[PDB]
UniProtKB/Swiss-Prot annotation, chain A:
Domain called PITH: residue spans: 1-168
MF terms in GO: disulfide oxidoreductase activity; protein-disulfide reductase activity
Its biological purpose: Active thioredoxin with a redox potential of about -250 mV.
Stated name of the protein: Thioredoxin-like protein 1
Superkingdom of origin organism: Eukaryota
Localization per Swiss-Prot or TrEMBL: Cytoplasm; Nucleus
Complexes and interactors: Component of the 19S regulatory cap of the 26S proteasome. Interacts with PSMD14/RPN11. Interacts with, and reduces EEF1A1.
Zinc keyword on record: no
Tissue expression summary: Ubiquitous.
Shown residues in whole-protein numbering: 118 to 289 of 289
GO cellular component, one term: proteasome complex
Naturally occurring in which organism (per UniProt): Homo sapiens
Curated annotation (Swiss-Prot), chain B:
Organism: Homo sapiens (Human)
Domain of life of the organism encoding this protein: Eukaryota
Self-association state and partner proteins as the record states: Component of the 19S proteasome regulatory particle complex. The 26S proteasome consists of a 20S core particle (CP) and two 19S regulatory subunits (RP). The regulatory particle is made of a lid composed of 9 subunits, a base containing 6 ATPases and few additional components including PSMD1. Interacts with ADRM1. Interacts with ZFAND1.
Protein family membership: Belongs to the proteasome subunit S1 family.
Physiological role: Component of the 26S proteasome, a multiprotein complex involved in the ATP-dependent degradation of ubiquitinated proteins. This complex plays a key role in the maintenance of protein homeostasis by removing misfolded or damaged proteins, which could impair cellular functions, and by removing proteins whose functions are no longer required. Therefore, the proteasome participates in numerous cellular processes, including cell cycle progression, apoptosis, or DNA damage repair.
Coiled-coil stretches: none
Protein name from the UniProt record: 26S proteasome non-ATPase regulatory subunit 1
Length: 172, 48, 288
């Protein structure tokens, strides 16, 4: 699928940055990133907080927050961008989201891609998802698949500086 | 019949054709001025 | 492809202040620092923050960018909430104007190696001593395209030719090896209502009655000098020499008696007296 001239951000997800909150031990965060039946569930409640980190500033166009049709899939998703610190569930609800989404049953489907307001996500470095409820009001929610579609924003790696012209010792 | 002609006339076909004919037939431009302008441009600005 | 002369290096209010402060700290020497911002699009380079790099014996050169210092600074600023990229570098040119030398060009090319749009900024803390801020944004002109194409920047708009090149920059290589970028200052309210507090004037200053002693002395001095000036105006008008009076009014123009040293003083006196009297009455009413 995917839109013209855009690429999935799976290669741009930094495993160091990503961290899930309320994830069940049996089904962890890594499962939801694989295009298999393996899924991620939340052990303590329907609320889940899934955050992902990007190696270099990436742009957000469309995200596929697929889930099971049993009713435990995501219903209301809150998103924040460039969060300096981890998110608390009490503080997450209070804060306004970058784009509050009310995922319809169509979006949850395997072929469902939920659009995002491209203007807001221009220099996203770490996007956090707050699933405030599931369709079926089940005790625990599940995310069959989850990834972001966008473009990689070229970033100056000043860690790769290095003189390319001239001789050492110069001044001014 | 008549309604088709009125519809065509309103839609802008006949008027556009007549205007194009008038412009093309009487089109007579002093190309020497544009030739002089061409030989007075070294800056791409003045080119566009 | 080609860079439009309409590209605009957006310099934030904080960035300009920090760059000026760092440049003024170093004088008599040259300071340098990396600029943090975003390459929002092809026709704009936005700088939000600028952090100084430590002064080193090397000077402003590729070796002034201490990799450990830069890495740790960026890492620690990311936590606070500033995950910005390095958009360019700035260095102070004490005395001389905003231009780029050979070592500057080498450093600019090294920066361009990372990103093709790494703008370079030059600020002179000594020239920028008054309402003038001599700040220029420079980028390298591929000497290759000097012949391969022609000039380096497309002119699809008029947003860039509304400025003028400087003899200094021209002498040191402007439009030859380096090309300037229009510097636009991104200022917002909150950052402009906070800066109108350097001199905001307390409410008390607008109710202080001055002092009547020096007020009387000033009134007396101004009135005496205005009496002398009225004598001069009398002499000038009563003369009314008609030997081409239109020429007379132009052959005696020296900012003198007629009106300049005239009613200028009337305005000074009347403004001072009216303000003082109004303040006195406002105090007589407000305070008991």
């Amino acid at each position: 699928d995917i839109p013209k001239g855009y690429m999935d951000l799976m290669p741009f997800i930094n495993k160091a940055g990503c961290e899930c909150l309320n994830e069940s031990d049996e089904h962890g965060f890594d499962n939801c990133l694989r295009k298999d039946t393996t899924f991620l569930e939340s052990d303590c409640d329907e609320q889940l907080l899934i955050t992902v980190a990007f190696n270099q500033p990436v742009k957000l166009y469309s995200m596929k927050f697929q889930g099971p049709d049993n009713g435990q899939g995501p219903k209301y998703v809150k998103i924040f961008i460039n969060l300096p610190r981890s998110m608390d569930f009490e503080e997450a609800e209070r804060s306004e989201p970058t784009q509050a989404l009310e995922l319809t049953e169509d979006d949850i489907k395997e072929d469902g891609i939920v659009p995002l307001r491209y203007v807001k996500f221009q220099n996203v470095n770490s996007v956090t998802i707050f699933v405030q409820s599931n369709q079926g009001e089940e005790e625990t929610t599940r995310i069959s698949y989850f990834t972001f579609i966008g473009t990689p924003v070229q970033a100056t790696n000043m860690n790769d500086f290095k003189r390319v012209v001239g001789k050492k010792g110069e001044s001014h | 019949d008549q309604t088709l002609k009125m519809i065509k006339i309103l839609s802008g076909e006949m008027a556009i054709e007549l205007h194009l004919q008038f412009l093309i037939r009487n089109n007579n431009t002093d190309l020497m001025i544009l030739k002089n302008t061409k030989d007075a441009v070294r800056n791409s600005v003045c080119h566009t | 492809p080609a860079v439009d002369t309409a590209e605009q290096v957006y310099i934030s209010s904080l960035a300009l202040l920090k760059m000026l402060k760092h440049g003024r700290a170093g004088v008599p020497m040259e300071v340098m620092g990396l600029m943090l911002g975003e390459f929002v699009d092809d026709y704009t380079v936005r700088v939000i923050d600028v952090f100084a790099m430590p002064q080193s014996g090397t000077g402003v050169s590729v070796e002034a960018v201490d990799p450990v210092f830069q890495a740790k600074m960026l890492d620690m600023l990311k936590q606070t909430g500033r995950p910005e990229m390095v958009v360019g570098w700035y260095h102070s040119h004490p005395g001389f104007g905003c231009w780029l030398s050979g070592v500057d060009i080498n450093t600019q090319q090294s920066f361009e190696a990372l990103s093709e749009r790494a703008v370079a900024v030059v600020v002179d803390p000594i020239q920028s001593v008054k309402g003038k801020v001599v700040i220029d944004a420079f980028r390298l002109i591929n000497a290759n395209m000097m012949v391969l194409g022609h000039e380096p920047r497309q002119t699809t708009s008029n947003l860039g030719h509304l400025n003028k090149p400087s003899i200094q920059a021209l002498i040191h290589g402007l439009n030859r090896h380096y090309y300037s970028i229009t510097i636009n200052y991104r200022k917002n309210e909150l950052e402009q209502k906070m800066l109108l507090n350097l001199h905001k004037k307390s409410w008390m200053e607008g109710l202080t009655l001055q002092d009547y002693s020096e007020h009387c002395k000033h009134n007396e001095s101004v009135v005496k000098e205005m009496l002398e000036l009225a004598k001069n105006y009398n002499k000038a008008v009563e003369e009314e020499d008609k030997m081409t009076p239109e020429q007379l009014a132009i052959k005696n123009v020296g900012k003198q008696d007629p009106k300049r040293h005239l009613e200028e003083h009337v305005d000074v006196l009347m403004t001072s007296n009216i303000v003082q009297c109004l303040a006195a009455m406002l105090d007589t009413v407000v305070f008991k």
